[PDB]
Amino acid sequence: EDTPQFKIDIDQEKAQALGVSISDINTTLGAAWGGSYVNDFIDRGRVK
Amino acid sequence: LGTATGFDFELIDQGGLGHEKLTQARNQLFGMVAQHPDVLTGVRPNGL
């Protein structure tokens, strides 16, 4: 059933006026709160 | 088909021991089969 959701409004104009790129904002939000998959590594010989 | 003579044996690494441990185990097995010239003949690797 429906659940409460958090809506964060990003003002593009203010970000531009402060010299902050939109890509940086979106990447920061997604990585910090949603987790970002960067690349792989070898753990005991297996790719993870 | 291939040669279709003899046997094809694979020495798998089921514990994540690495390449060095696997090669050491293969060398040990070669040392073992060298003691039975009357049953096993021409046991050699198929790799570099």
CA distance A1 to B4: 64
Tell me the C-alpha to C-alpha distance, in Å, between residue B1 and each of B5, B42, B46. Answer: 11, 20, 17
Report how far Cα B2 is from the mean position of its chain's Cα atoms.
Answer: 18
Structure determined via: cryo-EM
CA distance B11 to B13: 7
- Is residue B25 within 8 Å of B11, Cβ to Cβ? yes
CA distance B27 to chain A (A): 21
Q: Is the dihedral of CA A32, A37, A42, A46 positive or negative?
A: positive
DSSP symbol at A22: H
- What is the structure's resolution, reported in angstroms to one decimal? 3.0
3-state secondary structure of B36: coil
Residue of A nearest to B18 (CA): A45
First to last CA, chain A: 35
Residues of A near B (Cβ–Cβ under 8 Å) read 44-46
Tell me the C-alpha to C-alpha distance, in Å, between residue A7 and each of A4, A10, A46. Answer: 10, 10, 39
